[PDB]
Each structure stands twice: as C-alpha cells, then as structure tokens.
C-alpha cells in the first residue's frame, strides 16, 4: 500500500505539534498533582494502549474533560506527551526508572521497548541488582535475563551491594540456586547468604531457613549451625529440627565458577577450514587441550586484546574488508564468559589499526594504533571508562611510534617503542621520560611480570629486562626466525615461542624461565597432535575461561 511520507507525514506531525503548543483543537486535559496538560485524544490513542480504552469505554472519563490521573509524575508524562507529538524521546540516564514506571503505566509499547533497550545496554557495574529488582517488580523477562547473568558475574565478586539486601525471596532464590555463580570458592556465597539473613531475622526466619537449605551441603558444613544457635529466637524447637534435615539430601553437586582455569587466549589463527581467513582459539596449560572461541565480528580482523585484573576480555579497533560487490572500524566488543558470544559496547572516536589496550586503575587505556594517521599531533591516546562507559581524551603521546608495545606495572602506564620508553602517570595525566634502550628493535611485545618489564624479541632473541625501582635496562641471556610471546603463567614468568626453518614444520613449545638463573628450562612441549599451526599475526594473552561454555577445536592430529 502506498504510504508515502515525503514532505507529508512530517508536515502532518509538525501541524499537530503546532496545534499542541498553541493549545488548539484540544478536548482533553490531564490533571497531574495540580499541573495541567491540555492535549488531544487521537494522539493519546495512537501512542498509548491505555488512553485508547480511557477514551473508548463509555464510563465517566469519556465525557470527563478534566480527568484526574494520579500515580504518575509530571515530567515523565510531559516527556511521553512530547514524544507522542514529535517522535523524539531524548532520554537521560537518571530518570529512566520513573519513565519506564509510567511507560508501563500507560502500556506505551514503543517507549517501553526504547527504555528496555536503554536499560539492557546500561547495566555497567552498580545498578545491576537495582535494575534487576526493577525488572522483577515490573515482570520484564528480557531485562530480567541480562540482569540475572550480569549479577551472576559481578555480584559474586562484591557480594556487599547495599541494594542487594533489599531483594524479594523468589529473586534471591533464583539468584542463589542457579549454577552461574562466578565464584572460585563455595564459602563466599555461604557468608553472602548469611549476611542477607543477619540484617533481617526473627519475623524472616522462614526466609533464613530457605536460603540456608539453598546453600546446599557444600556450604552447610560450616559455622551455619553455631551462628544460628547464636541468633535464633528463643522457644524455637521445630526450627532446629528442620535445620538438622538439611545436611544429607538435595543433590550435592559441584558448581561452575570453580572451573576458572588460567588459560592462553589466542586470536587470528590459521582457520582450520581453508579459505576462512582467521580464527580465535585458546590453549590450556594444565589440561593440555586446545579450545576455540567465536570471532567477535566474524569478518573484521587486526584487533587488540586486553585482560583486566577481573579476568575480562575486550576487543577494540580492527579492519574489515569493504566487501565491494579493508576498511577500519572503531567498534568495541566484550567477550561473555558463559554465553560464548560478544556483546558490543560504546565504540571509539577514531578508527584504529591494531590498538594497544592497557588496563590500569579500573580504566582501559588504548595507546596508539593508527588513530587516524593525519593528526596534527600524530602522537595521541584515547582512554576508556569501564564504569561510566565513555571515552575520555587524555595527555597525548610525546613522540609518534609504530609497532609499539605497552604494559602496566605498579598502577602506572608504560609504553615501549624501538628505543624509548615513557611512563604515563594516570593521576597527574603527564608523561615522564624514562630510560632508553641501547638496542633498536621493533615488531616486538613486552610482558608485565611482577615489578619488571621483559621486552622480548625484536628485529630476534633480545632479552632486555627493565626494573621500575631501579630504572635500568640489562641483558640476561639468549633463549635456546623465532616468534616470541612472553606472558605470565601461574605467577611465574614463561614464554611461548615457535621456530620455523626451511622445508621444515613449525613446533610449539613453552619454557620456564628463572629470574636468578637466566635460563629457560623446558616446561612443556606443545604436541602437534592437539595444536595445529597458528600463523604470524597471532596474539597471546593470559585469562581465565570456562571449559563447559566453550567448545573444543576439532582437528586431526
């Protein structure tokens, strides 16, 4: 059907807006705690699913011109009316709750979906349990699930949120009884359930018993009984009887968060499947297996990795082929530790090629990486805010460097280039000159192990160790065209190198390096029966993953 809108629908909406702001042809007025809102019935019927029944049903409101609508905020109803009259919402970050409250009040489906998306995108660090209780009160399965997983991930690291105390039982039961608790130990959930019953007892003793049972035998074999003898109300006999029941039944099973194996995440591998360009796989140091990961964009490559102290994976920048009949994109992504997917985040402001992301003081710092190339000050850096979810410009780099590396030592930013090093102080937002290397090597990376930076490789086997407390560069030894990948494994400095000769196959083997010995002892030789060739542009980083969520990479020995 022909529904042309060229200069017609916009003109109609502009005429309606003009009639609204001039108070013309209005036949209904909303009374909101003394505030008047003259409007029309047609717009309220086409926008809200409640006003259509308010103006159709032949009751009292039908003839009532002065309808007194209560339990609604003035500003929220005003923004809903102006959204109905112009189509633009222009929502902030503070009044989203009351907006959704009154949007669900009038079943206004479009603004409901808009606010639902805005809330599902903005579960950053703190409003998680709050918006989870919000979605529990206003049954919203979409928001409910994302918030559920978000809490399963972060709540099991703070378990002290002020909002977490005020939760309904069913929601707490769903949270605690789930097998998605990202906890490496079983006593933290026990004490967390405990403190949730240390603020409210006596009248709430039923909930106490329920959560106690939920904790299961794994955490029921603790001080739970003694703490209860201490806080139980007097003259309670059957309560001890029902508490003694919880010890032998109800399927004691292992949890999921304990499977936080410290593994080796790789990217841009040799797609086991021929013409496929690249793939992201993983390696297990202890399990001696090779797991795979899903490509974040599935077509874009040349990305940079970073791992926060909370074991989080991020991906920024990269280039994607234009697919006309490689363009650079500043998109951003984050790896899910359980869903084996990639949820995007706030993109960058500059399209970078192979950005070097560094985490420090809870902030992500992307140093260099072909920001735009044609900058007036070619040396610049853009940092990320993991809490506010925004990018903040900081003091630019002193000199323009290419194929550089950057690490973080002692809560400070350290970027390494051919021969120079600069310490970005995040507190004073300044760059202090550091020691210069006597050797000029590029195309190499550095590792931040302890309080020493180990710049390995370059063009080789150059081992130049730097210390922060000493501020000096020294050599240790030569590792016995190697592709070096220095990294931290089990609080012990190790390396992952691959050698390649003429008419010979590649071999993967990791060595154990000692500080005072200056020697790379043979730790483990990666057999080719489990791991195949990776390539040249592959990257390495240390991080904890889950074996059950991920899938093994099928490949013939």
């Amino acid at each position: 059907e022909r529904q042309i809108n060229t200069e017609y629908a916009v003109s109609l909406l502009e005429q309606l807006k003009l009639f609204y702001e001039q108070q013309l042809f209005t036949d209904i007025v909303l009374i909101v705690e003394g505030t008047e809102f003259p409007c029309h019935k047609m717009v309220l019927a086409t926008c809200s699913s409640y006003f259509r029944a308010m103006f159709m049903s032949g009751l009292s409101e039908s003839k009532q011109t002065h309808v007194h609508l209560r339990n609604v905020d003035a500003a929220t109803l005003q923004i809903i009316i102006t959204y109905a009259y112009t189509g633009n919402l222009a929502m902030n970050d503070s009044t989203v709750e009351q907006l959704y409250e009154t949007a669900c009040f009038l079943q206004v489906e479009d603004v409901l979906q808009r606010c639902r998306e805005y809330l599902i995108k903005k579960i950053n660090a703190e409003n998680c349990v709050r918006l989870l209780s919000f979605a529990d009160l206003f049954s919203c399965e979409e928001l409910k699930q994302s918030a559920k997983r978000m809490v399963e991930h972060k709540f099991t690291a703070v378990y002290h949120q002020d909002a977490f105390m005020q939760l309904s039982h069913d929601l707490l039961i769903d949270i605690l009884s789930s097998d998605n608790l990202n906890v490496e130990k079983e006593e933290t959930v026990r004490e967390a359930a405990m403190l949730w019953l240390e603020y409210n007892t006596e009248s709430r003793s039923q909930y106490l018993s329920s959560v106690l049972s939920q904790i299961r035998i794994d955490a029921l074999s603790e001080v739970t009984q003694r703490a209860w003898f201490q806080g139980l109300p007097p003259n309670d006999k059957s309560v001890v009887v029902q508490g003694l029941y919880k010890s032998m039944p109800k399927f004691f099973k292992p949890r999921l968060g304990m499977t936080k194996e410290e593994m080796m995440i790789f990217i841009e591998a040799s797609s086991e499947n021929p013409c496929s360009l690249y793939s992201s796989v993983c390696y297990s140091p202890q399990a001696e297996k090779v797991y795979k990961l899903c490509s974040p964009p599935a077509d874009l490559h040349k990305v940079g990795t970073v791992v926060t102290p909370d074991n989080d994976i991020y991906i920024a920048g990269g280039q994607v082929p234009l697919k006309n009949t490689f363009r650079t994109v500043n998109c951003f992504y984050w790896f899910d530790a359980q869903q084996n997917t990639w949820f995007p985040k706030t993109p960058m402001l500059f399209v970078r090629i192979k950005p070097s992301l560094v985490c420090c003081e809870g902030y992500i710092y992307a140093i260099g990486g072909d920001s735009v190339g044609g900058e007036l000050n070619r040396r610049t850096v853009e940092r990320y805010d993991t809490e506010k979810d925004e990018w903040t410009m900081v003091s630019p780099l002193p000199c323009a460097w290419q194929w550089s590396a950057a690490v973080v030592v002692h809560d400070c930013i350290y970027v390494m280039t051919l021969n120079l090093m600069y310490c970005y102080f995040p507190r004073s937002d300044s760059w202090v000159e550091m020691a210069m290397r006597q050797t000029s090597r590029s195309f190499a990376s550095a590792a931040a192990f302890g309080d020493k930076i180990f710049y390995i490789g370059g063009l080789s086997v150059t081992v130049e160790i730097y210390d922060v407390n000493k501020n000096e560069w020294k050599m240790a030894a030569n590792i016995p065209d190697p592709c070096v990948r220095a990294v931290v494994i089990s609080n012990s400095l190790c390396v992952f190198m691959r050698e390649t000769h003429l008419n010979e196959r590649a071999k993967y083997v990791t060595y154990q390096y000692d500080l005072e010995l200056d020697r790379w002892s043979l730790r483990q030789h990666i057999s080719e029966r489990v791991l195949w060739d990776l390539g040249r542009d592959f990257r390495c980083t240390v991080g904890k993953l889950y074996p059950s969520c991920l899938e093994e990479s099928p490949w013939k020995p």
């Binding site: 102080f425 507190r427 004073s428 202090v432």
Partner: protein, 77 residues
Amino acid sequence: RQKVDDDRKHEIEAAIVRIMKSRKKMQHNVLVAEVTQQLKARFLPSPVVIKKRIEGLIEREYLARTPEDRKVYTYVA
C-alpha cells in the same frame, strides 16, 4: 649521637628533594613509604622524625607540600 641524628636528617631531606622532583604526591602517607623503602638498608625509618621534618620544608618554597591543600603539589623548582 646528635651528629648522626643530623646525618639521618640530611639523608631523608636530600632523598625527598631529589626523588620527589619527578615522582608522585602523598594525599596522606603515600610517598613516605617510598622514602622509607629507599632508606631501608641505611637506618631506621623513624616515622615521627620524618613526619616532623617533611612539614618544615612546607613553608620553604621548594616542595610546598601545602598541608591543607594536599591534593596537588607544586611540580616546580
């Protein structure tokens, strides 16, 4: 004894004026840990002595270390 007490005074003061001219700032007790780690194999950290002596160079231009405005130190000479 008094001579070496004056010697320790010299040590701590010099250490501070030479290192902090390119280091961090102490909201309360941040840089004192560093100045004590630097003089660990020299003598005793002497917390009371160093705390009494760092607040004397406050009114002496170099290292203003404003006590009340202990949020940004003068990175000048």
